[PDB]
């Protein structure tokens, strides 16, 4: 039930590693060593004396040590035997890479796998998974990418190929990861159990889940756990089978009955969960939520050097139920010290296309320093009057010198110089996007989470 020693084990066994470097078991072992696991690693193979410089054993039960986690990479017709041996060895977690269970119609074998694990007090992850990663333990027990950016996002995936691809994609999108967990068939340990761990994990600040469904009779506990987690950490769900038709399709891939779209949505709302309709949305939101505090009020300012970007922003916020209000006179006055008379202060604050780089510094600084400003979305349209990197650094400097932390998102539009500036900002953990609608949707996720959290709080109100 406690997953502390799943994510932070003293000893891990890899069953099914081989002299053959091409086999899955060997790939997992290689990632474990490459990524820098500091505990003991025990390759398990019927004949090998040693693998990758480590003493090998034919059985986990032969290991002169207490193995916390056994990563099992042997064919399905050999899994149950390994489970019995791990049971005898006192193993706590069986991470079953192996395919060929419920997802191919062998429901009985899968149920026997779980029944057998449990008779030894052992829990199962999977089967049919690509493993798991835990950054704070320098633990990469996957056959996916050898590395991820370190950070505070835990990503749980029910899908295999897309999950392992998304693991790589986090790098391109500059998302810092605390954990990757492939849950696959989800025959035993599931989202509820994982949420309970990440709740208590000081290394994890955001949880993103690719989810198709949860097991019958598991939903009430899901809401109970998810709602409490949401009080402190945002949960983003990428729902597979969002539509009636998609729900029918995805269910038969898992070998299950199709769940109710409407009720899942209601459950997510009651859980304070944010449902993403796409990979891009999920990643964009995760970035912002990972790198920003939650807004403490509705006083969101949009700063732009062009009305057009500002209008795209306004429309996008409106689509999300977010409406701008007049800026504080103190803020307006501060900005009028350098801004032309034909600037607009309706919110968005339009500092006009003639704005040089340092106006972004001063405008951003004034906004973030103002006590009646809760959040800031900064928009930039590349002109010959500016340098994109100059604007980016001005934003960086303003944030640092504000000596505080309010949610900020940035949207920059332009050519290759804007592309590099956006990259620069994101590597500084400032949520930046190449369009104003994406920057606004990202900020919209921060407010959506604030409102989701408020929903949960109200629902838990004492009579």
């Amino acid at each position: 039930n406690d997953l502390e020693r799943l994510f932070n084990p003293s000893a891990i066994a890899v069953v099914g590693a081989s002299k053959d470097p091409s086999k899955i078991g060997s790939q997992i072992l290689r990632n474990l060593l490459s990524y820098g696991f500091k505990g003991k690693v025990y390759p398990i193979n019927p004949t090998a004396d040693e693998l990758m410089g480590l003493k090998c054993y034919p059985k986990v039960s032969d290991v002169p040590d207490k193995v916390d986690v056994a990563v099992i990479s042997v064919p399905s017709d050999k899994v149950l035997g390994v489970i019995d041996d791990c049971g005898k060895a006192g193993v706590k977690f069986a991470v079953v890479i192996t395919s060929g269970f419920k997802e191919v119609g062998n429901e009985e074998l899968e149920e026997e796998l779980v029944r057998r694990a449990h008779s030894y007090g052992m829990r199962v992850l999977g089967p049919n998974i690509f493993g798991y990663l835990y950054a704070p333990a320098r633990l990469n027990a996957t056959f996916g990418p050898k590395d991820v950016l370190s950070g505070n996002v835990a990503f749980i995936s029910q899908s295999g190929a897309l999950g392992i691809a998304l693991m790589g994609y986090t790098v391109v999108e500059n998302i810092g990861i605390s954990s990757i967990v492939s849950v696959g068939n989800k025959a035993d340990l599931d989202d509820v159990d994982l949420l309970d761990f990440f709740d208590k994990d000081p290394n994890t600040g955001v949880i993103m889940i690719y989810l198709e469904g949860i097991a019958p009779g598991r939903g009430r506990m899901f809401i109970d756990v998810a709602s409490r987690v949401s009080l402190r950490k945002p949960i983003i769900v990428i729902k597979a089978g969002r539509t009636e038709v998609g729900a029918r399709a995805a269910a038969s891939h898992t070998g299950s009955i199709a769940g109710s779209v409407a009720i899942y949505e209601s459950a997510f709302k009651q859980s304070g969960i944010l449902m993403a309709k796409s990979v891009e949305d999920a990643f964009d939101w995760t970035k912002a939520l990972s790198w920003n505090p939650i807004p403490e009020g509705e006083r969101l300012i949009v700063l732009t050097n062009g009305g057009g970007a500002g209008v795209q922003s306004t429309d996008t916020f409106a689509d999300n139920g977010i409406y701008l209000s007049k800026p504080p006179e103190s803020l307006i006055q501060e900005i009028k010290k350098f801004v032309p008379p034909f600037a607009s202060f309706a919110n968005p604050i339009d500092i006009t296309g003639m704005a040089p780089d340092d106006w972004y510094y001063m405008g951003t600084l004034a906004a973030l320093k103002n006590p009646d400003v809760d959040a800031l979305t900064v928009l930039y349209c590349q002109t010959a009057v500016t340098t994109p990197i100059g604007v980016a650094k001005g934003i960086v400097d303003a944030i640092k010198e504000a000596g505080n932390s309010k949610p900020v998102t940035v949207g920059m539009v332009g050519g290759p110089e804007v592309a590099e500036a956006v990259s620069f900002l994101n590597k500084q953990r400032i949520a930046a996007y190449p369009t104003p609608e994406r920057a606004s949707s990202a900020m919209s996720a921060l407010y959506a989470y604030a409102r989701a959290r408020s929903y949960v709080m109200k629902s838990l109100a004492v009579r």
């Binding site: 949860i214 009779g217 939903g219 769940g259 009720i263 629902s459 109100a461």
Partner: protein, 225 residues
Amino acid sequence: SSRDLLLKAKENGRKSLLEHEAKYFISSYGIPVTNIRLAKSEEEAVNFSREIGFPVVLKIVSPQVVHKSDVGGVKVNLRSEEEVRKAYREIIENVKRNVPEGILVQEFAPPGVELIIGLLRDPQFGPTVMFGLGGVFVELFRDVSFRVAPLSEQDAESMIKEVKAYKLLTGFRGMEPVDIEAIKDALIRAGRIGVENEEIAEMDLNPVIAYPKGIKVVDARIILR
């Protein structure tokens, strides 16, 4: 205990409660229903019709009759005792000849805004409460909202505001705003019924009439498992 109704139904191999039993059960949970009484005779009604107040609707009560109207098991807008003696003998006459428990005497329901409150069991999330406006709005447009039980006040209120037809509840041409607090209260209690009574597979409160003050369930189905 109201559980006796469920126990009796189970021991008699029934998969639903009879109409009066269903009304009694939900009433015992504090959900307002149309006043009803069960007549075991034509004369037993006069004290009840009198007590309840004219006009009274009469309904046959029998495990056999799934549909009350096709057999001729219903009689509406009965406004006096002589009119009960007639509508009573007629329903005995009618159903017997169509199909050889008693007669239900039910109070009149003044018009208002009709609602539906549902309770179903979802495989994942268990007991779940459904809300929607009556008539075409649920039946034709399928405008409904869901919340997994137990419901908080926040759940009840938000699921009400969420349906497309919501404005039918906040006043419009020739209709005053209705008692939204009473609706929230009934939704929460419907969830509680589902949570607490495992032998209830499904429940239908349909139609429910909302008024400027309070609400009333007119008909209710409770399905057992």
